[PDB]
Amino acid sequence: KGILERLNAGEIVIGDGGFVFALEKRGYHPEAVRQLHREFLRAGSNVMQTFTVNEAAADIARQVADEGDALVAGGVSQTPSYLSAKSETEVKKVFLQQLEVFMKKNVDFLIAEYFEHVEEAVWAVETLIASGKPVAATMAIGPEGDLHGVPPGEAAVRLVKAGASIIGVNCHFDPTISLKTVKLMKEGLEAAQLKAHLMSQPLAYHTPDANKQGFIDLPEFPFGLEPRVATRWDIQKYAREAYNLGVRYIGGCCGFEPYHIRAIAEELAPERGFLPPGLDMHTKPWVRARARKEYWENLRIASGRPYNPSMSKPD
Amino acid sequence: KGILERLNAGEIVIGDGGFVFALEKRGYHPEAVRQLHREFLRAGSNVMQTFTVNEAAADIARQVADEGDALVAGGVSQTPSYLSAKSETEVKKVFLQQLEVFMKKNVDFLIAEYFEHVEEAVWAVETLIASGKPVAATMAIGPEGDLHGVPPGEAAVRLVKAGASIIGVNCHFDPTISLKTVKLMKEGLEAAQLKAHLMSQPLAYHTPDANKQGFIDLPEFPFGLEPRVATRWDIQKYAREAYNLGVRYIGGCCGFEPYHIRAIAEELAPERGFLPPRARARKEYWENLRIASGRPYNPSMSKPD
Amino acid sequence: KGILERLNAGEIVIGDGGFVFALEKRGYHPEAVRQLHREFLRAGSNVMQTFTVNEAAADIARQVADEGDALVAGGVSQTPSYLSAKSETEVKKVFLQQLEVFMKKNVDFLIAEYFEHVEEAVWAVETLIASGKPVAATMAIGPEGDLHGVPPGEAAVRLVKAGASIIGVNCHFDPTISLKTVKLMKEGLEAAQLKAHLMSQPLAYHTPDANKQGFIDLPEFPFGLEPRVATRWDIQKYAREAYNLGVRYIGGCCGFEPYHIRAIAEELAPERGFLPPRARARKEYWENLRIASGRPYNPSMSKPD
Amino acid sequence: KGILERLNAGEIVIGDGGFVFALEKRGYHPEAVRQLHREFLRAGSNVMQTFTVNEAAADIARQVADEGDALVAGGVSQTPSYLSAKSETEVKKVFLQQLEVFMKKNVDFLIAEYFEHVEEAVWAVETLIASGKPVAATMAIGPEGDLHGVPPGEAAVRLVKAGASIIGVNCHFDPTISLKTVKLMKEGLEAAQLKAHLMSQPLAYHTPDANKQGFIDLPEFPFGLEPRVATRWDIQKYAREAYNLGVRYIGGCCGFEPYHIRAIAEELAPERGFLPPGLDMHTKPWVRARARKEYWENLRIASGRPYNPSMSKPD
Ligand SMILES: [Sm+3]
Ligand SMILES: [Sm+3]
Ligand SMILES: [Sm+3]
Ligand SMILES: [Sm+3]
Ligand SMILES: [Sm+3]
Ligand SMILES: [Sm+3]
Ligand SMILES: [Sm+3]
Ligand SMILES: [Sm+3]
């Protein structure tokens, strides 16, 4: 079953969140890459991504995807070259080169991931639909819109018009700010009487202090982000709210690890009809008392850093 | 080089801190276990631990240790029998039991790991040395001592007298509180004219709010600990302080992942002699950045239950 | 010098910010009222406010104002009648009512203080100018505007058109959010070719967690606000920013005590020309010290109810 | 009724906390001093203090004390001259000079306040009892003892032996650390089979981060302490716990204002049989919901400073 088939039938598709983030974190060896893909699959991901040999990358993904109920998706991000002034025919040529690797490896679908400029997001979708494969487009923007002042609603409209059947947001903000952005996008599609499936790949980092440029501008980016990491409970709340908003492609970006994906899969186990592939016996009474979801759902966890602030100023 | 030859040759032994926590976190598949081991070895760990299939765990650990400059260590922790009050010979029997397997698999050394009672740790040391292999003993206690009131200085002295060639602290507090405990253990050994290598396997979780029982009593244990996780800069400061205090077997316990081990190897790359296998590009910015929690609606500390 | 002569002569008018909050805090005795007034005048305030016995309040204020370089001002705030939906002529009547007393006691000027609705503020301005005395109008709104959605730029324009010689913001947010609102009010007046003196009477409580309704909706209002209190360094930064933005009637509202007013006078002593009546000895240490809350078990922000 | 009479009958005596702190805060004029004394009396204080003309100071205190149920107490603090090496006969001469002003003005009792060295605290009590007036002694020390390593228990013992009928702690730590110190003192008196009334004049500032030197060593001392100020609820909890510990002279030191004293008086209004000399009608429902002691007693108030830490390192 393909990605549009699943989603058209109202299924909840779970992404393989921060694959790249995790490979980075682990210090990367096909075995290392195959093992990570497997952890995401075991956690419940229905998508195994590959990027940009590029062919071995695609092979390993396909290999693990065949071990469960998952698809292989090829992703492309913004060229770093747009800031390099050079953009246009040059941009589509790069996308085109990557499109070939993917068609050649016969991926299940494509994702225009990481894009801060709608204009460039569009060029990507235009090039990608020429494969005849389903295309998903996400924008690395918050409620205020992209780098040109293009609002989320309008960005959503233009991406669908360009041919994306799945739109959403990713990689710049935490789950809460990301879903607010997706709500804006959803309202853009409604007002324009257009339809598309929605997806969200938020950061697993809390970013209440970020400005419109996202977490990259926080002073802790990228080596002091540990304190902000979402617990599994934070992610279950995100999964539930995403589900309630109409999001059906629920994933994650930087900060996401297999256990965050498993939390999504477990939170939505009822709705999905299945679970992805002993605290109550602990010796201490007060520890046993924590073996109840309600306890964690209501606990305001401490940071453990009394000498540090709870927020920082961007820049 | 054996564990003791390394240490006597002035080398820094990097532990594979967090092994069990990582597998638990990744959700566990010999390949899954083999990969995790490789990550630690690749991060610079000189020890691949193995516990209690048993023959398999020991075999995978040995295979990855073979792949690099690492030893395999057999770990033993506090037993239910002792807490369930069977004491004496009875407790010595389960360790002997465990030893057997580590004997047959021929592990390089043994660690009496995770003991909240000095007494039971001693009984563990006395049993493990019957293996003729070097024995390391670590206590899950803080500056205030073990569960019967035995202070760190004394605990260190009884562990060495019992035959441990390496002693220290592990798994109950963050790096700073753990090293203060180690300092107390070291002053004890000195006041007693005793000598032994020191080790530390602290939590990678900041724990300023814990009482003498350790992080377990904190209400966030074990599923709400994320905010407390040490950054690599916190870990590098820990490695540096540990080295300066005289610690030469530097590892970690719950919360330590491979990247934390790697921070230790890089920090101490000059003292070791090699590395393990825009203004934010400067290490001193990170060493001085008071990172934010990102959780303004949450407290900074909790009271232990 | 009258309020308007002072301002046109380039002077900085220091308000007696916090008067009601202080008396409320001290628990209220004409002597008690007279002393509080003296504290503000002694801290540098150039205005002694009076509201609504009435003749007494006005008399005590005048006596202390007489003692120094201060004016007496009659304050009027949003009425229940307007919120209780009587609007139009009815609301104008209670202000006229209030004016009467301030007319007989001969106060120096009038302030339409504390209005969450531009419309009712205008009706207040239109009534108060019938006194022939200068009228100041301040809004209890933030950057997002009043309760009907009227933005700061527009609110400022309608208040001046209505006859207010002085406009600004008061009592709903901390100094920074209040001055951002003032900046918006100033851009409105500019886009409309209008001119008027500006004033600010912010809360002395830090309020980063409030929504458009102001600090009242925070769960700590009104008895758990202590941690939020501005230090004198926070107040000096506010005075300096207010001056730089062009504000010349600089006061405060809830939370401001005499020492906060004094911080304003000292900060601006060079721009005024006089003062009001071991490495911690340096002002730049205080200007840079990120003070601790002393409440590690409490959050740093709360969600408005 | 005198101070020993009240306390011997088991009455709860309420101090006039941070009189000096408050006068400082207000920028100081007999009228200013009389008004402050009155606010404390109106708040419930049974003691009006005067210090070190000194005579006018004593007159005003007496004057206001006569307006209610209060006594006038003369207080003496450590000489700053002990750090000036000069100490002994020199110290008692200063105390003696002050003792005369007070006997001359006929105060009701005397307080050896602010003392960081037990040795010097003792000299003060020795000089002061020579007036035939009741003497109270407090130490500015925490659980670890004074500047010489003299523990609280022993300090308590020596002060009583020197002639103090009332002992306690003050001016260096918050209510919680101060009462722990008083508990230690109380245990010292018990073990030595001695008896004395207990008193506490803690800071109204939370100081969980202070070292044995007290709040003077925190970096915010003395101009950045605002965030630490106790709410009236924090003080009611202190009053109740002080009462439960056996403390019967309940006061305060730096940071205390009349409203903190009133909170003590109200918390203990039942036990005392009287109160010292409209939120529920507020327009907003959620505001009306706060007119219940339980709400405040259970509310973990926010600091309002997300960009600041919750604790600082001493020094
Ligand atoms: Sm390589
Ligand atoms: Sm939220
Ligand atoms: Sm299984
Ligand atoms: Sm530290
Ligand atoms: Sm009355
Ligand atoms: Sm600011
Ligand atoms: Sm003077
Ligand atoms: Sm407490």
| DSSP-assigned states of every residue in chain C | --HHHHHHTTPPEEP-TTHHHHHHHHT--HHHHHHHHHHHHHHT-SEEEEE--HHHHHHHHHHHHHTTT-EEEEEE---HHHHTT--HHHHHHHHHHHHHHHHHTT-SEEEE---S-HHHHHHHHHHHGGGSS-EEEEE--BTTBSTTS--HHHHHHHHHHTT-SEEEEESSS-HHHHHHHHHHHHHHHHHTT---EEEEE--SB--TT--TT-GGGSTTTTTS-GGGB--HHHHHHHHHHHHHHT--EE---TT--HHHHHHHHHHTHHHHTS----TTS-HHHHHH-----S-TTS-S-----
In angstroms, the first-to-last Cα distance of chain C is 45
Identify from D303, D308, D310 which residue to disrupt to test chain C contact, counting C C-beta atoms within 10 A and taking the largest count.
D303
How many other CB atoms sit within 10 Å of the CB of residue A150? 18
Please check whether residue A263 is in contact with residue A239, taking contact to mean a CB–CB distance below 8 angstroms. Answer: yes
> Cα(C153)–Cα(C190) distance, rounded to whole angstroms?
9
The answer to whether the beta carbons of residues D166 and D229 sit under 8 Å apart is: no
Separation of A115 CA from ligand 3 center, angstroms? Answer: 39
Mutation target vs D (from C215, C284, C295, C305; most D CBs, 10 A cutoff): C295
Q: Which residue has the tokens 């401001």?
A: C256
Ligand number nearest to the C-alpha of C296: 8
Contact state of B299 with C299 under an 8 Å Cβ cutoff: yes
Give the C-alpha separation, D259 to D268, whole Å. Answer: 14
CA atoms within 13 A on the CB side of B80: 2
- The Cα of B292 is separated from the nearest Cα of chain A by a number of Å equal to 5
Three-class SS state of D52: coil
Quick check: bond before A222 cis, omega within 30? Answer: yes
**What residues of chain B lie within 8 A of the CB of D310, using their CB?**
299-301
Q: Are C79 and C94 in contact (CB under 8 A)?
A: yes
Cβ of C104: how many Cβ atoms within 10 Å? 11
Residues D150, B102: Cα–Cα separation, whole Å:
54
Q: Is C192 annotated as ligand-binding?
A: no
Gap from C267 CA to chain D (nearest CA, Å): 15
Which one of the ligands is nearest to C237 CA?
6
- The burial of B55, by beta-carbon neighbours within 10 Å (0-12 exposed, 13-18 middle, 19 or more buried), is given as exposed
Q: Give the whole-angstrom CA distance, residue B218 versus residue D182.
A: 28
Indicate the helix (H) or strand (E) that contains D90.
helix D89-104
Alpha-carbon distance of B290 to B302, in angstroms, equals: 20
The type of residue at B241 is E
The structure tokens 């790249």 sit at A20
DSSP type of residue D48: E
Neighbours of chain B (3+ CB pairs under 8 A): A, C, D
Distance between C127 CA and the closest CA of chain D, angstroms = 26
Identify the DSSP state of A133.
S
- Cβ separation of A311 and D306 shorter than 8 Å? yes
- Residue B12 is encoded by which pair of tokens? 């820094």
CB contact under 8 A, A309 and C290: yes
Would you give the distance in Å from CA C212 to the centre of its chain?
A: 18
| Number of domains making up chain A | 1
Separation between Cα atoms, residue C147 and residue D299, nearest integer Å: 29
Tokens standing for C248?
A: 């010349």
Q: Residue D170: helix, strand or coil by DSSP?
A: strand
Give me the residue from B296, B297, B303 closest to C297, CB to CB: B303
Q: How far apart are CA C154 and CA A10, in angstroms?
A: 48
**Cα pseudo-dihedral D292, D298, D303, D304, rounded to 10:** -50
Q: Are C175 and C182 in contact (CB under 8 A)?
A: no
What secondary structure does DSSP assign to C189-237, as a single string? HHHTT---EEEEE--SB--TT--TT-GGGSTTTTTS-GGGB--HHHHHH
- Residue A11 Cα to ligand 8 midpoint, Å, equals 50
* Resolution for this PDB entry, in angstroms: 2.2
User: Is residue D249 within a helix (H) or strand (E), and if so which, with residue range?
Assistant: strand D249-250
Candidates C297, C302, C303, C305: best to mutate against B (most CBs of B within 10 A) is C297
* Nearest partner of A94 among A104, A80, A83, judged by Cα: A80
C158: CATH:
3.20.20.330
Contacts of residue B33, Cβ cutoff 8 Å, sequence gap at least 6: B23, B57, B60
Q: Which listed ligand is nearest to B206 at the C-alpha?
A: 4
Q: How far apart are CA B279 and CA B256, in angstroms?
A: 28
Of C206, C227, C185, C235, give the one whose Cα is nearest residue C17: C235
Contact criterion met (CB below 8 Å) for C98 and C107: no
Which residues lie closer than 8 Å to B203 by C-beta, 6 or more apart?
Answer: B171, B172, B173, B174, B175, B178, B215, B252, B253, B254, B255, B256
Task: Find chains touching chain D: ≥3 CB pairs under 8 Å.
Answer: A, B, C
What's the CA gap between A233 and C159, in Å, rounded?
A: 50
Backbone torsions φ then ψ of D137, nearest 5 degrees: -130, 130
Contact: A309, C296; criterion CB under 8 Å:
no
Nearest CA in chain C to A310: C300
DSSP chain B: --HHHHHHTTPPEEP-TTHHHHHHHHT--HHHHHHHHHHHHHHT-SEEEEE--HHHHHHHHHHHHHTTT-EEEEEE---HHHHTT--HHHHHHHHHHHHHHHHHTT-SEEEE---S-HHHHHHHHHHHGGGSS-EEEEE--BTTBSTTS--HHHHHHHHHHTT-SEEEEESSS-HHHHHHHHHHHHHHHHHTT---EEEEE--SB--TT--TT-GGGSTTTTTS-GGGB--HHHHHHHHHHHHHHT--EE---TT--HHHHHHHHHHTHHHHTS----TTS-HHHHHH-----S-TTS-S-----
Q: Please, which residues bridge with residue C137 across strands?
A: C112, C167
Count CB atoms within 10 A of the CB of residue D227. Answer: 25
Q: How far apart are CA C76 and CA C73, in angstroms?
A: 10
Q: Identify the DSSP state of D17.
A: T
Closest CB to B301 among C209, C297, C301: C297
Which one of the ligands is nearest to C174 CA?
A: 6
Range of the domain at D166: 1-315
Determine the Cα–Cα distance for residues B217 and B215; give it in Å rounded to an integer. Answer: 6
State the CB neighbour count (10 A cutoff) for residue D246. 11
- C-chain residues within 8 Å CB-CB of A305? none
Cβ-in-10-Å burial (0-12, 13-18, 19+) of D63 comes to middle
Q: How was this structure determined?
A: X-ray
Q: Are the Cβ atoms of B232 and A209 closer than 8 angstroms? A: no
Q: Rounded distance, CA B228 to CA B221, Å?
A: 11
Binding site per annotation, positions of B for Zn(2+):
171, 253-254
Of residues D220, D296, D310, nearest to C224 (C-beta): D296
Question: CA-to-CA distance for C53 and C61, rounded, in angstroms?
Answer: 12
Chain centroid to Cα D236, Å, comes to 15
Phi, psi of A75 (to 5 degrees): -115, 150
Judging by DSSP bridges, how do beta strands A166-170 and A135-139 pair with one another? parallel
Write b or e for each residue in D205-216: b if 16 or more Cβ atoms lie within 10 A of its Cβ, otherwise e: bbbbbbebbbbe
Residue B257 — left, alpha, or beta (φ > 0 → left; ψ -120 to 50 → alpha)? beta
Q: For an interface test with A, which of D298, D307, D312 has the most A Cβ atoms less than 10 Å from its Cβ?
A: D307
The two structure tokens encoding residue D267: 């918390």
In angstroms, the CA B301 to CA C300 distance is 12
Give CA A266 to chain center in angstroms: 17
Distance of CA C205 to the CA centre of its chain: 13
Q: Which residue of D has its CA nearest to C35?
A: D32
Question: C-chain residues within 8 Å CB-CB of B209?
Answer: 296
Residue A287, H or E segment: helix A285-288
Asked whether the beta carbons of C65 and C57 are under 8 A apart, the reply is no
Tokens of D77: 């603090």
The token pair at B141 is 């206690």
Report phi then psi at C8, rounded to 5.
Answer: -70, -30
Q: Report CA Rg, chain A.
A: 19
Q: Which of A35, A209, A301 sits opposite B224 (nearest CB)?
A: A301
For chain D, the C-alpha Rg in angstroms (whole number) is: 19
- Are D12 and D243 in contact by the 8 Å Cβ rule? The answer is yes
Q: Judge: A310–C290 Cβ closer than 8 Å, yes or no.
A: no
CA distance B294 to chain C (A): 11
Interchain proximity D300–B299, CB inside 8 Å: yes
D287-293: list long-range contacts, CB under 8 Å, 24+ apart: D287/C216, D287/C217, D287/C221, D287/C305, D289/C305, D290/C219, D290/C221, D290/C223
**Cβ distance D168 to D180 under 8 Å?**
no
Does the annotation list C171 as a binding residue? yes
Q: Give the integer Cα–Cα distance in Å for B103 and B61.
A: 15
HSE-CB for C130 with a 13 A CA cutoff: 14
Residue from the list B296, B297, B299 with its beta carbon closest to the beta carbon of C297: B299
Q: Could you tell me which residues come within 8 angstroms of residue D85 by beta carbon, excluding any fewer than 6 positions away?
A: none
